[PDB]
Design a protein around this ligand. Structure first.
Ligand SMILES: Nc1ncnc2c1ncn2[C@@H]1O[C@H](COP(=O)(O)OP(=O)(O)O)[C@@H](O)[C@H]1O
Ligand SMILES: Nc1ncnc2c1ncn2[C@@H]1O[C@H](COP(=O)(O)OP(=O)(O)O)[C@@H](O)[C@H]1O
Ligand SMILES: [Mg+2]
Ligand SMILES: [Mg+2]
Ligand SMILES: [Mg+2]
Lengths: 354, 356
């Protein structure tokens, strides 16, 4: 009766991106092929509640999660969250064919130890049979992915504090690929291009090269928009909130562009340039067809122009909601201005439709 | 721990297999974000008396046709979505004990569903979905059950096995129609989400009217009239067999008297067919008009049949084309697909189930 579809298959999940400085919620639905944004909200975190990709203050995250639900105003209580790909170990091993799912699980629990740095008791294991081994029909190819149990369990607890349940623990790299596939309109078929996605966060910048939809390269750096925030704080005597608000609202003195924003803009360019060079010297690729700017920092005025000017590669700000429709309860202007920072959240929400 | 998704979920694309009374249709779709693509497509006629009405009679005959439709389609997919007719499915909402798991619920549902379903206890296939807490009593839950005869599932399951195919999903044809209809938004000049459309599927031995309001089916009527009538009229008049007459219909090498004595009278009979069925639906509810009439089925490819119906009923009419906004695989014959499009609605809808 598992095959029965006498009842129409009818199951959406919240896209919840937990970063170092904020919590982002996105809810999607679709009618045929066209997607629609049901709900959206962003909540700042208490400082040092989430350092790096690691949750430290559990209650602080839970509170942030609780409040972001209210502003989004949605009914959904199940969500998709993600761990960093840097925290996941992936390995392809071969196993005996003809094993049941339980037998396969038992063997993989015991032998995972042999394929993972982590101690055996602290590991969350995910697996997938790929098919029969090419060499030998007696064996199957098994994909194995592991991370420390702590990473899953801490996010479990964090969502629980907001009454939320993680139906799926995704990997940020996968979420990026899903939302990037929607940029095909904004770009030619995303299915035939080589594209450098530069996610410029607050404290973290990440280059992700995608060829025909699949990630083929990833590099990270401790560079981000907080650098711009801290320089506004220092020059004008503002707190983190005031300075962050000042970026968007633009109420700063005349010397802001030349003394603060442009030097930061240049640091962004140098950062992007070095990362591309690292990628070119890492494989067959000599060039990318496009650079897609992502993260809140990508909304900096004419940052895309500057990168085009200094690098010579077509650059645009990510907007996964270009073709989508909107619920009347969603602010079109707010979403549009925050669009490049919602790539991960959108990709997490797209996991509902896989 | 099935929350884990450390490995990316992928690769669950299913063949759309539309089994009718006279043919088997295969369609394979892929996706690139939201944009769909036609990967594979083939059509194989069925041996006579293999499928009468919606009932499979010659199992080996359907299996063999399925084997042959695979070769022509040239696909590596071995999993498929097949459908039963909605007339074979009963839908009922019943009230059950709360706190029971789904597995717990299914076992007990065998005993409880019997009172409400017109099928034998040991001969029924039951699908169910919990809706939520009962309004009458929050200690109980409302459960939607949909049932059909076990045989309808098993025979299509066996037919596919004979061709090395697996039925991963047994869909309902009405659901398949809704999925492919949602794609007509472009050609219809309006969003499928806000529109009222009467879909007239004119098959070989059957015509079916389906009214869709904002994307959902709110009415369905069917009759045993179809393109075989045209074929049977060609058979007798010119002394041609089923194959020759059916081939002549599309190719049309026929004698000058074909248009006035056979083709046009059939055109008019179709109009009479569509006309009555619409009046049935208007007199069945608030609706006094439909915005569009969508012609589906192979018989809908009769030239200017859409214009005739539009003029004689007064409602905008077009021939269904679910592949308008789709890229095509290089191995797929663009011309053949274009001419067979209105007959591929169900097959397209079945393949779209891969993405639900
Ligand atoms: N319109 C904007 N202009 C400039 N900077 C912005 C804008 N919107 C957001 N930011 C910056 O984006 C940074 C946060 O980026 P985001 O990717 O959304 O979170 P994270 O960096 O934690 O992943 C903050 O430093 C904020 O100052
Ligand atoms: N181009 C065409 N012109 C006229 N009739 C056609 C054309 N193509 C197919 N037909 C007729 O349409 C019928 C096929 O209907 P179809 O929907 O494919 O069958 P079913 O749904 O009953 O399996 C056949 O009787 C065929 O003669
Ligand atoms: Mg981020
Ligand atoms: Mg009964
Ligand atoms: Mg049909």
């Amino acid at each position: 009766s598992h095959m029965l579809g006498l009842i129409k298959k009818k199951n959406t999940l919240l896209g919840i991106d937990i970063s170092s400085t904020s919590v982002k919620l996105l809810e999607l639905s679709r009618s045929g092929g066209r997607y629609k944004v049901e709900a959206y909200a962003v909540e700042p975190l208490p400082p040092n509640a989430v350092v790096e990709k690691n949750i430290v203050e559990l209650e602080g995250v839970g509170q942030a999660l609780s409040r972001v639900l209210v502003k989004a105003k949605t009914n959904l209580k199940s969500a998709v969250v993600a761990v960093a790909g840097s925290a996941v170990i992936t390995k392809t091993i071969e196993m005996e064919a003809g094993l049941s799912e339980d037998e396969l699980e038992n063997q993989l629990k015991i032998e995972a130890d042999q394929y993972i740095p982590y101690p055996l008791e602290e590991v969350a294991i995910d697996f997938e049979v790929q098919g029969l081994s090419a060499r030998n029909p007696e064996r199957v190819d098994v994909l194995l992915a592991a991370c420390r149990k702590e990473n899953v369990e801490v996010r479990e607890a964090a969502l629980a504090l907001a009454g939320l349940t993680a139906k799926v623990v995704d990997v940020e790299a996968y979420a990026l690929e899903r939302s990037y596939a929607l940029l095909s309109s904004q770009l030619a078929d995303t299915d035939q291009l080589t594209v450098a996605v530069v996610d410029i966060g607050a404290t973290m910048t990440t280059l992700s090269v995608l060829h025909n939809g699949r990630t083929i390269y990833t590099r990270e750096q401790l560079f981000g928009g907080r650098q711009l925030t801290e320089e506004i704080q220092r020059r004008y005597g503002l707190s983190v909130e005031e300075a962050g608000l000042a970026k968007k609202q633009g109420g700063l003195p005349d010397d802001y562009d030349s003394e603060v924003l442009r030097p930061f803009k240049d640091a962004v360019v140098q950062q992007v340039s070095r990362s591309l060079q690292f990628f070119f010297a890492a494989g067959q690729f000599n060039d990318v067809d496009y650079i897609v700017l992502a993260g809140g920092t990508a909304s900096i005025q004419d940052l895309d122009r500057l990168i085009q000017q200094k690098i010579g590669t077509p650059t645009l700000v990510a907007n996964p909601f270009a073709d989508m429709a909107l619920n009347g309860k969603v602010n079109a202007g707010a979403l549009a201005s925050d669009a490049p920072a919602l790539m991960i959240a959108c990709g997490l929400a797209l996991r509902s439709f896989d």
